[PDB]
């Protein structure tokens, strides 16, 4: 029916399933062996481009890999800025290498404070 | 004066009697200004006329197909459904094709 | 540049 | 005579349908533009043929692609592509 | 390493 | 919150429809004779 | 502005009630619709198979760019309820069409990494709805935005050689690189409609006399210097003398006079080259002569600071002498200075032999002497 | 006639005409011989 | 359109002339009727050699890999494909103006000789 | 999907009054109208 | 001569059931025939019908070209200069493809780029043009911009000097060759595609397209 | 009104209330025959179908008057430009009839 | 008078407005 | 039968609608006229058909060649029963002229015209004229 | 001829609303993680957890929602 | 009289069955 | 592999688990399922490190249909403003749907309010728009409208009005249906559906006018550093556009004149949301004057607002009348006027 055909609740709305937990509901191990870079497709990999980014806003820290060859515009589609606000939002600032592996194991405010008073 | 409320016969009669192409065109043009009903019965006052009700008449109506069939379109219309540069294009090809000898 | 035969202008301009 | 009737009546039937032909694809004095082939390719037509040609080629292996071209946002051997198109 | 991770048998 | 456009008892309390009123050209008609 | 700011903010109320009830039809349908959010708009449109509302669903709130919103109108027209047969279904209007392509046009102005879905979407749109000239015009109009002028060139070639006349409303809005189609389309801006409407007679008359390619080399030019590029506005010269477009008197005119006004600051050999052949077949004695002189003189300063200048080929040598001497058997105008443009050109002997020139002139009664100033009005825009 | 504005065969006509295209039940070439 | 109006031509003699003096030079001739892409002769001895393996019966993976590289590594895409149909299209009725300039020529000449 | 607007035998027990005033031949004067004349 | 077509449109087969009918065809016949009419009293422009401007006659015109008013003005809308050759008396030219600039220009910048100062809002304004469309589309360009009193002769210059000239006649009737865009893109879904492709007859009979059809049970009993 | 039926009108743009200035070549008496544009029109369509090598406006309008019919019919078929001031005044029947 | 005195403005106004294509 | 053999060589054919450019129903009612049913034109040889094509029913040659296809193949033209009162289905088997042009297969043999009803009556049918 | 006169005779398209009617009767879920395949465009999104629950839809392209 | 026709009027949300209609109550 | 149409191979089950464990699936075996092994050349793997979880989104684009693909279904944005562009139009849609779920079918009890509309076929006319409220709503509804009609009658002459006029009808339903909610969530649903206003679009306002002082700010300083209209605010960015054509690149300079009223807009709009805010906190017996009258323009643009729905009904149904007209120019005996000449035409007698 015609009800579904533009926008909301359309066909090929990949949003209208639902939306991830997102709250308080692990330690450092299930993430590490988690974590993008630790794992062997990307690990034995240096031909595809690798771009680290930090909110500013959330404090977190973002990485992606060969956006270039494919700059899907759905990619933080899922994603939630600043006190439950939607993706948008991000005031993304570049970061290096070395910082995000130092940032990523500290909270939200602890990155924010490193980014706001220790640049 | 009352367009639909002139005597149908006498209104076929007077069309009937139309064979001149811009009058033609001008009745063409005058028909719509007829009622919707007005019109069907036009048709049907004719139809009968050059059918059956023929001998009704003092003088034997004259025939005049044109005016049948143009007044049968215009009451079912009304009724439910129930160029110097083309030449030149031209003749350009046809230089063309004789430059390829496809035309010997 | 044409030449028709149902002009309205021109009965009302001769007179004038 | 009839010979020279019939043949004369042939040529005014053809000279009227190439006129309607032309006159099909006028859009206001423009005549229809061929379809435009994607980028780099090049078509070819004998004319009174049933059949057109169309080709392309890649000086380098496949990097020259349009799809390995676009990421917006060795010497490999060079590659040639020859397109037979009939009309079936 | 199942059908859906592995997607053959 | 969309709308839909659309469009063996009997209604008693809708009266019969009959005729009342002129026709534009009758009325039109009226007042030419009464100028006159 | 200001006197002007009173009269808008009290645009921002919605009518009343009782008014929006008792307004016509089409009144009613287009404000309501395009207060309505876009998807919202296309549905109803959807629903009721009324097409002729597609730029209200154009001008809305919260629209996606042109090449999502081109896909939208066709699922609209194939979800439709009434399906007229398809070669009437599927075929959009072609002035939808351009505006569609102009406001692709004004975005890639912005950035003109939108060419590439600009591609795209042309590409589709070709074999989807018919190949119009204005719509080829717009695309030509996007293809410059994005700074390809060989391309555009190309295409307005292939224009000139199909016999499709460029579109004047195109051309207008080349010439207004500030003014997207819809607030154009708009009774909005008003004061730039004296020169909207100047700058499409102008495009009508040009085609009186001249082709497509000219037109729009013209367009592109204009734009080029309305948008303060300047290092494409003398490619555009030279890709129309690399293709053979032949320019419009009046672009060979205005390129001389910016010509001035540069003194060849950024004019490169190769611009040089092509804007003296078109100068040549077209222009007159005296811009021949101040370019042809402008380009040495400015070459002598920074001679060792533009090390890559390149002079005059020997072959087309022959080109521009047969089209000088063509002029100067006819006019007495071009005979006089007909050797020494052709020594001028051919460039052997420069700095002595323009001097004994400007000698001679001299006796034979003032100079271009602004090779001193090449400097002192020349860093002041860089600065 | 007055609220659907057709007649029961006009009706009848119509459908058969409006379904003639899936209608036809011509005769298909025969001998169609097992694969698997 | 007017970069290069030969370079069709420029390839087909390059490929050409390397063939017919590389090895197999005698058997050149073969391999151009072979290769040929308009006759009748040229597809019957396409059928003489061997004709690749029914795609339906390759392996799934294979026939998506191989469908990835035709379209987008080698460029031949969906795009070109409709617009060899609409070219197809095309050019028939361009011919038909043609056959119709023929069939008046060939009336018009008999009525003059007539 | 979207959601559509709501629209709206009668017991004994009921007043079996009037549900509302009907007024056709008021608001349409239709003129008289005879096939016969 | 009868070109074949390049549509994917397809009626249905007598082997497969009927199936999918989340979308699903049908013949659409209105009421009335409509082409007789004026191209904007048709049924794809009924919305546009308080807005279509007030119909001027020849009669009316006979009269004002001897006797007319000072605050009147006929407006020529004819756009090919080679095609008009004649000139309505008391007329101004404006052509219908720039309206929308000339009625925003200011009154000294219109007086300016046409030679006659743009008439006051509350004038009578009368439009003509060979057969009507130019006049209607110019009006309509008058009323946006809020001309009370706007008319167009809807019988113009063909029916002053008895001309058989015709107006705009740019119809975008898709070319056989291009495939339209349900049947190349890929949007929607195999089945939905499917039915939305199919046609129940010769696909120039003005099919309607109905979306989610029920069974009639108490009639199959 | 002179200027405007010239081919170099197309590179001005005009102004309908007091046109601005056109600098035609006419206006340079330095200019030739063979440089004025209606001179250029009038010498193509001569060769054209009157099959004369015409230089200057007398030896046109003498190759006219001399011309035999059908040459005459065929000039003033391909001739536009009978009147350049745009001043209403009587003409031959040619563009009649 | 008044009449073809305006008639030769209107052509004129249409001359100066747009031109149709030149002669070869 | 010769209606609707007309109607259905002039309507739309195959699964696209490819409309037939020539309309044969013109000339029903000069058959019809004529006398000359689907079984006598059946019946009628290359000479009569020949005539009756030239003379009588003026067929142009692109509608003879059209038409050709129904006569060389002598359908049996027989009205068959498909669920209505109206059958518009008419046998389109080969024709046999053992059983009069008509497929003798089930019920279509000598002389019979309609599926259900009954065979001709040919004494009768002489009363034509 | 004579005289000349002076007679004394002497905003739009704003989107200031942007209003939309929000009313869906569709499912909403708590998600872990969604893999969307279709035949060409393949999305895999996870969250971190211990333990999963799967759902998959073949309703008209692969689905499978971990919960 | 817009008023008139537009007043928010009270909706028995569970079937008649599970909730006694009230204009059935009173009668 | 060379697979026939007929033939299967048939191979083992690895575990009871099935192709697809029902009962559940752990964490390492999640793992694998997420990663899984795609052509890396056409996949974009991404993080976003938070808090307590990772969050990953690894996204494939076959090579094969690039071409046809909608823009739509395949998300691309091979530029920067495609980029934002295609960011902010999925973010609209999936905050449509994600707020749309909380006051739809699934929505709460309290929270879900449907309409009741009826209209005449013949007359074209609304002989009913209403709200399906609850006893709390009414209740709300009749505390307002007694409230008011105890003063409102006694200083309002009512000689036009009438006596049972409804005082800020609109305003105070739309009010109490905010009021029968139970969730913020639909609060805020109802308020955007509501002219807006809602907590996010007066942000998204107030984070537009934070950005323009900052504007105004940077002009006033170059100004000064290198007469002004009374409010400055209003044109910064114009003054900006302007400034950066003429200094920087600025390939293009503004004109977009619908910024300048923002400032009055925005607080008239926050004026809206916290009168419409007091109201349901039932604080309506105290009224300043620039309240009551912020209440008399909000009443009046909201009386439109809801009508939206119905005047599209209403102007299909006006369609259909049309086609059901009598053909042709209307028949002698319906028609006052003449045909073919106008009504005032000076020869209107013969
Ligand atoms: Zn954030
Ligand atoms: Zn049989």
Same mark, same amino acid.
């Given at each position: ?112 404070? *490193? ?5 | ?104 | ?16 | ?39 780099? *390719?090049?078509?070819?037509?004998? &004319? ?41 | ?9 | ?36 | 502005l200001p006197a002007l700011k009173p009269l808008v903010r009290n645009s921002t ?13 089409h009144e009613?349908?287009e404000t309501?619709?395009g ?17 002729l509302?597609f730029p209200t669903?154009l001008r809305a ?5 042109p ?26 209007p072609s002035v939808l069409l351009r505006t569609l392509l102009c406001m692709a046009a004004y975005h890639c102005t912005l ?22 000239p204005e719509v080829?015009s717009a695309?030509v109009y996007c293809?410059t935005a ?19 006349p460029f579109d004047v409303t195109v051309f207008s809005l080349m010439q207004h690189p500030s003014l997207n189609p819809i607030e154009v389309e708009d009774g909005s801006v008003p004061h730039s409609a004296k020169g909207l409407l100047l700058q499409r007679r102008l495009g009508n008359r040009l085609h009186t ?6 037109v729009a080399?013209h367009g592109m030019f204009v734009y080029y210097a309305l948008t303060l ?21 009046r672009?060979?005119?205005l ?129 | ?36 | ?114 | ?37 | ?50 807005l279509?401007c ?19 003005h006929i407006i020529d809308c004819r756009t090919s200069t ?9 007329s101004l030219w404006l052509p219908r493809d720039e309206v929308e600039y000339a009625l925003q220009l200011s009154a000294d910048e219109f007086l300016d780029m046409y030679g006659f100062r743009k008439p006051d809002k509350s004038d009578d304004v009368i439009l003509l043009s060979?057969?009507?469309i130019y006049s209607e589309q110019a009006g309509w360009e008058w009323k946006k911009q809020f001309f009370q009193h706007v008319?167009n ?12 000239? #015709?107006?705009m ?21 195999? *089945? ?30 | ?8 009108v197309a590179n001005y743009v005009g102004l309908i209330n007091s046109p601005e ?46 011309? &035999? ?29 | ?8 403005l209107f052509?004129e106004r249409v001359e100066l407005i747009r031109k ?5 | ?129 | ?5 002076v007679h004394?005779k002497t905003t739009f398209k704003f989107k200031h ?51 | ?27 | 592999?060379?697979?026939? *149409? ?95 779920? &909380? ?54 002459? #009512? ?76 044109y910064?960015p114009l003054y900006?556009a302007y400034?950066?054509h003429?200094?920087?690149?600025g390939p293009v300079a503004s004109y977009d004149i619908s910024t300048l009223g ?68 209307? &028949? ?19």
């Amino acid at each position: 029916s015609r009800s579904t055909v533009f926008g909301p609740g359309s066909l090929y709305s990949f949003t209208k399933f639902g939306s991830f937990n997102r709250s308080p509901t692990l330690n450092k191990r299930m993430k590490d062996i988690f974590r993008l870079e630790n794992q062997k497709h990307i690990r034995n990999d240096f031909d595809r481009e690798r771009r680290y980014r930090m909110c500013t806003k959330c404090g977190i820290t973002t990485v992606t890999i060969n956006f270039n060859n494919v700059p899907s515009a759905r990619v933080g589609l899922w994603g939630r800025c600043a006190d439950d606000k939607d993706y948008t939002h991000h005031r993304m600032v570049d970061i290096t290498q070395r910082e995000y592996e130092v940032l990523r194991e500290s909270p939200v405010e602890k990155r924010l404070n *490193w980014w706001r008073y220790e640049r | 004066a009352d367009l639909d409320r002139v005597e149908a016969r006498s209104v076929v009669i007077a069309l009937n009697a139309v064979t001149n192409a811009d009058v033609y065109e001008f009745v063409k043009k005058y028909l719509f200004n007829f009622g919707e009903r007005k019109v069907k019965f036009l048709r049907t006052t004719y139809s009968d006329l050059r059918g059956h009700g023929a001998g009704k008449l003092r003088i034997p109506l004259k025939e005049n197909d044109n005016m049948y069939y143009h007044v049968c379109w215009h009451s079912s219309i009304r009724s439910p459904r129930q160029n110097a540069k083309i030449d030149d294009i031209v003749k350009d090809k046809i230089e063309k094709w004789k430059a390829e000898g496809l035309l010997p | 540049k044409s030449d028709p035969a149902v002009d309205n202008v021109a009965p009302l301009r001769d007179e004038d | 005579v009839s010979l020279r009737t019939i043949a004369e009546s042939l040529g005014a039937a053809a000279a009227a349908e190439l006129r309607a032909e032309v006159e099909r694809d006028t859009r206001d004095g423009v005549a229809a533009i061929p379809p435009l082939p994607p980028l780099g *390719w090049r078509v070819r037509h004998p &004319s009174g043929s049933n059949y057109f040609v169309m080709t392309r080629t890649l000086k380098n292996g496949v990097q020259s692609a349009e799809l390995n071209n676009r990421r917006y946002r060795l010497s490999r051997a060079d590659v040639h592509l020859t397109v037979f198109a009939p009309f079936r | 390493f199942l059908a859906v991770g592995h997607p053959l048998v | 919150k969309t709308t839909v456009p659309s469009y063996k008892p009997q209604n008693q309390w809708e009266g019969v429809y009959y005729y009342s009123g002129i026709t534009k050209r009758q009325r039109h008609l009226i007042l030419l004779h009464r100028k006159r | 502005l200001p006197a002007l700011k009173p009269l808008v903010r009290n645009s921002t109320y919605l009518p009343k009630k009782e008014e929006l009830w008792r307004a016509p039809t089409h009144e009613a349908l287009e404000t309501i619709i395009g207060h309505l959010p876009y998807h919202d708009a296309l549905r109803y449109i959807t629903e009721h198979s009324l097409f002729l509302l597609f730029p209200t669903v154009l001008r809305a709130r919260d629209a996606p760019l042109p090449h999502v919103i081109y896909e939208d109108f066709m699922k609209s027209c194939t979800f439709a309820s009434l399906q007229n047969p398809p070669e009437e279904q599927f075929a959009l209007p072609s002035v939808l069409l351009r505006t569609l392509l102009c406001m692709a046009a004004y975005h890639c102005t912005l950035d003109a990494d939108y060419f590439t879905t600009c591609q795209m979407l042309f590409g589709r749109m070709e074999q989807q709805q018919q190949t119009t000239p204005e719509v080829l015009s717009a695309w030509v109009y996007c293809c410059t935005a994005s700074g390809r002028v060989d391309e555009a060139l190309t295409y307005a070639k292939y224009m000139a050689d199909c016999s499709a006349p460029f579109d004047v409303t195109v051309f207008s809005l080349m010439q207004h690189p500030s003014l997207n189609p819809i607030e154009v389309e708009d009774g909005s801006v008003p004061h730039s409609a004296k020169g909207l409407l100047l700058q499409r007679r102008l495009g009508n008359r040009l085609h009186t006399a001249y082709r497509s390619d000219a037109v729009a080399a013209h367009g592109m030019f204009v734009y080029y210097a309305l948008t303060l590029s300047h290092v494409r506005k003398w490619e555009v010269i030279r890709a129309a003398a690399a293709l053979g477009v032949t320019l419009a008197e009046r672009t060979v005119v205005l390129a001389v006079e910016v010509f001035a006004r540069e003194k060849g600051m950024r004019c490169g050999p190769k611009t040089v080259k092509a804007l003296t052949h078109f100068l040549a077949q077209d222009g007159t004695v005296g811009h021949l002569l101040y370019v042809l002189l402008r380009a040495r003189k400015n070459e002598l300063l920074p001679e060792f600071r533009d090390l890559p200048h390149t002079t005059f080929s020997e072959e087309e040598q022959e080109l521009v002498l047969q089209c000088v001497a063509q002029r100067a058997r006819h006019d007495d105008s071009f005979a006089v200075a007909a050797t020494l443009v052709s020594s001028l050109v051919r460039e052997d002997d420069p700095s002595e032999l323009l001097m004994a020139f400007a000698r001679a002139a001299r006796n034979h009664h003032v100079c271009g002497g602004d090779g001193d100033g090449s400097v002192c009005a020349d860093v002041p825009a860089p600065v | 006639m007055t609220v659907h504005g057709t007649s029961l065969p006009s009706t009848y006509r119509m459908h058969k005409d409006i379904n003639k295209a899936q209608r036809n039940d011509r005769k298909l070439s025969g001998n169609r011989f097992k694969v698997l | 359109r007017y970069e290069e109006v030969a370079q069709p031509q420029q390839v087909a003699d390059e490929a050409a002339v390397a063939c017919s003096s590389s090895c197999y030079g005698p058997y050149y001739p073969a391999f151009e009727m072979l290769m040929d892409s308009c006759g009748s002769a040229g597809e019957y001895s396409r059928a003489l050699c061997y004709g690749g393996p029914y795609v339906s019966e390759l392996s799934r993976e294979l026939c998506d890999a191989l469908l990835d590289y035709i379209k987008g590594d080698l460029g031949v895409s969906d795009q070109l494909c409709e617009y060899v149909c609409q070219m197809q299209f095309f050019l028939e009725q361009e011919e038909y103006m043609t056959w119709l300039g023929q069939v008046q020529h060939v009336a018009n000449a008999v009525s003059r000789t007539a | 999907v979207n959601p559509d607007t709501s629209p709206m035998h009668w017991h004994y027990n009921l007043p079996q009054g009037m549900e509302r005033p009907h007024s056709v031949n008021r608001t349409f004067a239709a003129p008289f109208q005879s096939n016969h004349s | 001569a009868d070109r074949r077509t390049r549509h994917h449109m397809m009626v249905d087969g007598q082997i497969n059931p009927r199936e999918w009918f989340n979308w699903h065809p049908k013949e659409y016949q209105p009421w009335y025939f409509d082409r007789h009419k004026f191209l904007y009293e048709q049924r794809q422009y009924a919305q546009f019908h308080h807005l279509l401007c007030h119909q001027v006659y020849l009669k009316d015109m006979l009269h004002l070209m001897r006797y007319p008013e000072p605050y009147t003005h006929i407006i020529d809308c004819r756009t090919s200069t080679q095609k008009m050759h004649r000139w309505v008396p008391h007329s101004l030219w404006l052509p219908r493809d720039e309206v929308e600039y000339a009625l925003q220009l200011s009154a000294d910048e219109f007086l300016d780029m046409y030679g006659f100062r743009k008439p006051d809002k509350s004038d009578d304004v009368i439009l003509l043009s060979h057969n009507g469309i130019y006049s209607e589309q110019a009006g309509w360009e008058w009323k946006k911009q809020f001309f009370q009193h706007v008319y167009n002769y809807r019988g113009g210059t063909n029916e002053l000097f008895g001309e058989s000239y #015709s107006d705009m006649n740019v119809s975008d009737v898709l070319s056989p060759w291009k495939g339209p865009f349900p049947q190349s893109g890929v949007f929607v879904d195999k *089945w939905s595609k499917r039915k939305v492709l199919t046609r129940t007859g010769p696909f120039d009979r003005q099919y309607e397209m109905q979306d989610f059809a029920l069974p009639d049970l108490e009639l199959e009993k | 009104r002179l200027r405007l039926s010239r081919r170099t009108v197309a590179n001005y743009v005009g102004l309908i209330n007091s046109p601005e200035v056109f600098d035609d070549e006419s206006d340079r008496p330095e200019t030739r025959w063979s440089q004025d544009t209606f001179f250029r029109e009038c010498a193509y369509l001569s060769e054209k179908f009157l099959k004369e090598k015409v230089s200057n406006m007398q030896q046109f309008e003498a190759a006219l008057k001399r011309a &035999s019919p059908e040459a005459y019919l065929a000039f003033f078929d391909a001739f536009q430009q009978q009147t350049q001031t745009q001043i209403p005044l009587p003409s031959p029947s040619v563009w009649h009839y | 008078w008044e009449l073809s005195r305006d008639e030769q403005l209107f052509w004129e106004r249409v001359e100066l407005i747009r031109k149709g294509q030149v002669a070869s | 039968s010769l209606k609707l053999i007309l109607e259905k060589l002039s309507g739309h054919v195959g699964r696209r609608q490819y409309k037939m450019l020539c309309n044969l129903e013109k000339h029903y009612d000069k058959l019809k006229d004529e006398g000359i049913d689907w079984h006598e034109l059946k019946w009628l040889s290359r000479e009569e058909l020949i005539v009756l094509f030239d003379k009588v029913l003026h067929l142009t040659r692109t509608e003879r060649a059209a038409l050709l296809p129904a006569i060389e193949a002598k359908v049996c033209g027989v009205l068959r029963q498909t669920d209505s009162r109206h059958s518009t289905v008419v046998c389109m088997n080969r024709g046999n002229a053992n059983h009069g042009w008509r497929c003798g297969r089930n019920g279509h043999t000598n002389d019979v015209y309609f599926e259900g009803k009954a065979k001709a009556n040919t004494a009768a049918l002489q009363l034509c004229r | 001829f004579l005289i000349h006169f002076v007679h004394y005779k002497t905003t739009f398209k704003f989107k200031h609303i942007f209003l939309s009617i929000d009313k869906y009767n569709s499912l909403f879920f708590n998600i872990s993680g969604i893999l969307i395949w279709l035949n060409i465009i393949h999305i895999n999104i996870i969250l971190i957890k211990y333990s999963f629950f799967i759902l998959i839809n073949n309703f008209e392209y692969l689905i499978i929602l971990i919960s | 009289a817009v008023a008139t026709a537009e007043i928010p009027a009270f909706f028995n949300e569970r079937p008649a069955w599970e909730r006694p209609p009230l204009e059935e109550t009173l009668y | 592999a060379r697979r026939k *149409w007929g033939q299967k191979t048939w191979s083992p089950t690895a575990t009871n688990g099935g192709a697809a464990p029902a009962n559940g699936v752990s964490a390492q075996e999640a793992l694998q399922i997420a990663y899984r092994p795609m052509p890396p050349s056409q996949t974009v793997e991404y993080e976003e490190d938070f808090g307590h979880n990772l969050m990953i989104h690894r996204e494939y684009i076959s090579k094969r249909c690039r071409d046809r693909v909608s823009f739509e279904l395949s998300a691309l944005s091979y530029s920067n403003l495609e980029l934002r562009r295609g960011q902010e139009h999925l973010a609209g849609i999936m905050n449509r749907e994600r707020r749309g779920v &909380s006051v739809g079918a699934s929505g709460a009890p309290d929270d879900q309010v449907q309409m009741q509309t009826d209209v005449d076929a013949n007359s074209r006319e609304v002989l009913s728009a209403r709200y399906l409220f609850n006893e709390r709503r009414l209740q709300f509804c009749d505390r307002f409208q007694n409230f008011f009609q105890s003063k409102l009658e006694n200083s309002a002459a #009512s000689d036009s009005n009438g006596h049972e006029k409804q005082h800020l009808f609109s305003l105070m339903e739309a009010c109490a249906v905010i009021f029968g909610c139970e969730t913020e969530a639909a609060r805020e649903t109802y308020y955007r559906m509501f002219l807006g206003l809602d907590s996010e679009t007066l942000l998204e306002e107030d984070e537009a006018l934070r950005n323009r002082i900052a504007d105004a700010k940077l002009v006033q300083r170059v100004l000064e550093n290198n007469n002004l209209p009374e409010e400055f605010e209003e044109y910064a960015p114009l003054y900006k556009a302007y400034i950066t054509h003429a200094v920087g690149k600025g390939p293009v300079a503004s004109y977009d004149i619908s910024t300048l009223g923002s400032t009055g807009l925005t607080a008239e709009r926050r004026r809206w949301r916290t009168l419409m805010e007091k109201i349901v906190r039932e604080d309506y017996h105290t009224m300043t004057e620039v309240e009551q009258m912020d209440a008399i323009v909000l009443n009046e643009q909201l009386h439109t607002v809801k009508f939206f729905d119905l005047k599209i009904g209403d102007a299909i149904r006006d369609i259909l009348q049309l086609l059901q007209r009598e053909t042709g120019v209307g &028949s002698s005996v319906n028609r006052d006027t003449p045909v073919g000449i106008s009504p005032n035409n000076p020869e209107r007698r013969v």
